[PDB]
Amino acid sequence: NDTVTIRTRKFMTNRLLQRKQMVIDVLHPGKATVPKTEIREKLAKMYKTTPDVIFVFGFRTHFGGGKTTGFGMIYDSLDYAKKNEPKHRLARHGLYEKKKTSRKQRKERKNRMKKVRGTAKANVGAGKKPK
Amino acid sequence: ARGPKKHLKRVAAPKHWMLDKLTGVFAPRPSTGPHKLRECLPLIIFLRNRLKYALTGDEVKKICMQRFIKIDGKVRTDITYPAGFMDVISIDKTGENFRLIYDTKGRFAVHRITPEEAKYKLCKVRKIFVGTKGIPHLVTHDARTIRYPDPLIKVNDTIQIDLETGKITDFIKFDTGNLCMVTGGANLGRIGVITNRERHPGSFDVVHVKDANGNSFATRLSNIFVIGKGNKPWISLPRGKGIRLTIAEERDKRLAAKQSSG
Amino acid sequence: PVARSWVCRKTYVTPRRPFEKSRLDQELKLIGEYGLRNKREVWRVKFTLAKIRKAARELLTLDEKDPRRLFEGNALLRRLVRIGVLDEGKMKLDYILGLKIEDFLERRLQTQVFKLGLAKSIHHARVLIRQRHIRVRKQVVNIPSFIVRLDSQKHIDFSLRSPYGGGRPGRVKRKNAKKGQGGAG
Amino acid sequence: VHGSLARAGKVRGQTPKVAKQEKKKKKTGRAKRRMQYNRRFVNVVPTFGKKKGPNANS
Amino acid sequence: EKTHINIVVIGHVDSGKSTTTGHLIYKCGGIDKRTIEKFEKEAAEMGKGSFKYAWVLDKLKAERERGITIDISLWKFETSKYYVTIIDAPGHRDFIKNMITGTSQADCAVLIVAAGVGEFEAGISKNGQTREHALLAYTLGVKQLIVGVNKMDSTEPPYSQKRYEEIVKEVSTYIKKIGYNPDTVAFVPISGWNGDNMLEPSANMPWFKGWKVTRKDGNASGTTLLEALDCILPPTRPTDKPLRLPLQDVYKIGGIGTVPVGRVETGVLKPGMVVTFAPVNVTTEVKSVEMHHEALSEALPGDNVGFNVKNVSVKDVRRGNVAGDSKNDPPMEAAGFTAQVIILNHPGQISAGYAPVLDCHTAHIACKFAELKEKIDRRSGKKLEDGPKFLKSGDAAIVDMVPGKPMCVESFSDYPPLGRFAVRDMRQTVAVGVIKAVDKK
Amino acid sequence: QLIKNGKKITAFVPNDGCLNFIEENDEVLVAGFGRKGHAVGDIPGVRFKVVKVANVSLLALYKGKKERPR
RNA sequence: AAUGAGUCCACUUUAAAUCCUUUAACGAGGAUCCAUUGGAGGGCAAGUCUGGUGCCAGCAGCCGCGGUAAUUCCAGCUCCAA
RNA sequence: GGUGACCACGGGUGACGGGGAAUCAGGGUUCGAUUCCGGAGAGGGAGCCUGAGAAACGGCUACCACAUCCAAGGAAGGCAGCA
RNA sequence: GUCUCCGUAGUGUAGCGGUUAUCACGUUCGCCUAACACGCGAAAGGUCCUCGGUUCGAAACCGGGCGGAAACACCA
Ligand SMILES: [Mg+2]
Ligand SMILES: [Mg+2]
Ligand SMILES: [Mg+2]
Ligand SMILES: [Mg+2]
Ligand SMILES: [Mg+2]
Ligand SMILES: [Mg+2]
Hints:
This is part of a larger assembly, with chains A, B, C, D, E and F. Chain A is an alpha+beta fold. Chain A has one domain (1-131). In chain A, 31% of the residues lie in helices and 29% in strands. Chain A starts with a strand and ends in a 7-residue tail after the last helix. Chain B has 3 domains: 1-116, no CATH class; 121-171, no CATH class; 174-244, no CATH class. Chain B is globular. The longest helix of chain C has 22 residues, at 40-61. At the D-F interface, helix 1 of D face loops of F. The structure holds magnesium ion (MG) (6 copies). Chain E binds 3 RNA strands through strand 10, strand 11, strand 13, strand 15 and strand 19.
């Protein structure tokens, strides 16, 4: 924490997705890769925002420690951040849930429903028996 | 095949799209539109690879579906809409306008224009035919056709289409001594003046063009777009004024720029 | 199908005839004098010089004032004087044919640290580079075959994390210290 | 068949089995190249012999 | 939760061994009336109508045409309390090697004798096979069993007291001699060919009031076969002990490849780790496991399952090979072993170099007795003398042998199911014993 | 006798005692004997040599690195 | 004195992981944490060493070696090439 | 009438064609089933509905060769797609 | 898994419930030669595939198992 610094570059703003995006590098001379949460709040202090709208990813560390570079994303509002931002990053921040079944099981149910025609009760009870 | 193709491999994409090899297997495959897919710039790569407003196809799809991209004064939500030559791309939320013009190396460059200049657009007439009730027509280099043109307008001349009306306000005849631009082939992107036109019946006419620096080249007639009345262009030219300069005088320009910046 | 590239090329050529005393002795002399691991990484620099000389000879066969000849000749001479194997005043295609693989081997990082005196021998230089002790500018390099340019020549120095610049002594030093303090109160 | 296959492996059978002598490990790679360069490139011998081979059975 | 138990049916030739279990499976719901009537109509042509219930177990066409069981076969059903599977035995002098495999891959047994006159006497005798079967069950490790007498409907009078009493006392004193406890083992009268006394107490015979069984775990009373088998002792499961799995057979199923089939002795087998087969010393990742055409996530001990393996052929691994987890201690080829044996009967003296066939789990390998170490008392393992020169019947001894063919054996001190073995020659069990010390190659 | 096309050939066994590792009805792998369908050395009319027997290499058997599959 | 190959916390990566790069802590004196594959008559770099075998076994792409003192087979040692 | 020693016609191909690959004084000699373009095929043939576009086969019809279930009355097939 | 056949020196096989031998050989040794070639005469070579049972005694009479040669089935 004593020697960790954020530096921004390729900064630009767009109103198309209502955000400002940049590529940043953080300097840890002798420490591990800085945690994305730490980048989040430090960049929030940098741009006078809160560490709930900050979005960072793609942090690759140069050979031999020291510099690591990632792509930073800041939005004007959390509602816009929810509106246009990938669901996996929303789930990383905990704002999106993926509590669903496997792709294989989903395909099994989709193919089993094709054997039953029209009848709504037998079309919704298709996957009830072969669990 | 048993029908039309609706895929485009990444390596088989047009070279001027400046796509790489490792991102994926496929290319945008632009939808049918006013321009052929060989010389069109789809909006996905225009807003992802040229301006970096979007990082992915999904993001550029969101940008398009929020109805901010305006092409030729009309809102287009097609992610792979073929933009093409000198169609005005207007974004009002961020307030800039783009004119899609080839650079000196035959690639669509990011050319920014004022709104009062973006209000209009040059077109190259491709055919003139009279239709029913004796009504003349005019089909441009786009898919755009219009009725009741000036009878002085002939084939492969230039017309001034102002947006939001689709009408003609002025025109440039294809005449010796007029400023042109090459729209295909090796000399793509070169601004020059019509010096000669040799015509070969039953084949393609060849036009000889000299630029400002005196470099004279030639190209087929179908690759020429008249852009100026004599020597003043009717549009805003990109950087370099469409003057193709060789690698010998490109390298030392790079060295001078590096020396100035260092 | 797959979005790979599979564009690769070999960097060395084996000699046409094996088991000849003159070539074997010359290659062993080079290996011993420059601290190379095997014959592959001297055939590699021989192949590089062969490619450079082939390009220079072909350019020489081109006519004078030919713009392709001029452009590629200045490009090749610029690269040669950046890597430092050619003097800045010898900007001619004829002098490229006069080069030798010793000039290229002298520009290796392994030889350069030994010449600068960061290491006591060429083999010590190689192991010192491999154990992440040598840095160029700010990047640490662990590749002995790192060709050093003239601008990067001055910026070769010990790494900060290594126990030769900054602190943080090695594991054996720390173990010896803790054994010593566990033996003596 | 004329019946001469009964002698297969005869000499390898009769050969007395002597074990390999346990020896120090040999340096490999750059160290091996350094060693064999040092042996035959940096040395001065005052003895005659007309440049005898490296495996002299003197 | 539900516990799975293996049951093996042992009996004599033409003793209704398959017929009464066909009745059992039909009444408990393994087959249907349409299938059983199809079996009846198929038996109608060549006249073997008495074995229409037997052909459910007699899967082979050769078995059907010969009227006998050649090799063991498996079936499944669910009982009112827990889940069991059933194996039949050939019950024939020629197919002792076939039936001992099934009896070895067992948790419990049911023994069948025909109650008619002229068959029971031949069934229990020196030439009789009931003695051999009851011997080999305890030899291979059938801790608890039941007995059901079949075909008392052919007796005079049909369904009678005194015949039942005399036969149960005879078999009771025999099993008391061999070790089994008549109080623990249940005694049932069943009329196979007529189909009586499997689910309900048949009213044709009222003289039997039901049996009572008393065991160290608890007490139970029974009136029908289901009531008997719903109170059997649940065998222990040595899951913590590393994986051992002798192979009953190897099939080549079209679409999936080579599927070994065997009963899991120790440990848990699940798809997702590499396994090693001991006698052939080949390594292979398991792909899937499956019981009775039903997929499983685990193979608990006592489970007769077939498991699919990858990149091997049917000729690499054969019957009798034992598989085990390579991450744990891997089973592997044993040069020889030390065995303590109880010799049962042999017309001549037993000397060194005697090479009978040793039957251990599924492997049936001829082994030559390398030498004899000492003679052993019948009980307590008492020392008698050292360095024997000959042996006779009714004697226990320490013997070291090496199998002629490659074989994997496990000491009884480590793997109980693989420690048991039998010795067969002249169509009698010559010697019975266990393994103490094994060397490893 | 080759498995494909059933042709009968003669293959040299190239070491001191590797014939002892060869028995009847073995599945052997045979390669060329050096000069493209021409006899080599003092062996008349032999153009093939055994490389593997029973899916174990003759070199491995000769060096004792692994054993016959009993 | 210096380091990894490995154990292994965290970060990072990623749809989620893995791997790489970072980074705690262990981790080298036969540093047993063990480099192999083919050769040593010539072509063709390397032994007229020693012990067996005795035109046998075998080697040998080709010349050729082996019939009791084998620079060529089977081995030990030592050398050679990658 | 048309085509042929300027090689027709016929046969063979261990022939899909090309961009390309190996080798490398120059000239050449071999290889391109293989990710890009074009063609052809969906077990072998053949015939069709629909549709702008198919002689489609993860569409249909028939025959041939295989082959699944069956209560023997019938019914259902096409991995040169990913595994 | 079942069945059919075979299994004696190293090959080619006589063999008797009271004897496994010879033969073309194959090997070794003398036998002449620097090396041979040809040629003369002897010796060894068997748990009768293995293990047992019947018998006073078996290789052979019988029971197994093994290896090889034939076929029949064997689909978690
Ligand atoms: Mg040697
Ligand atoms: Mg073909
Ligand atoms: Mg091709
Ligand atoms: Mg294709
Ligand atoms: Mg088709
Ligand atoms: Mg079709």
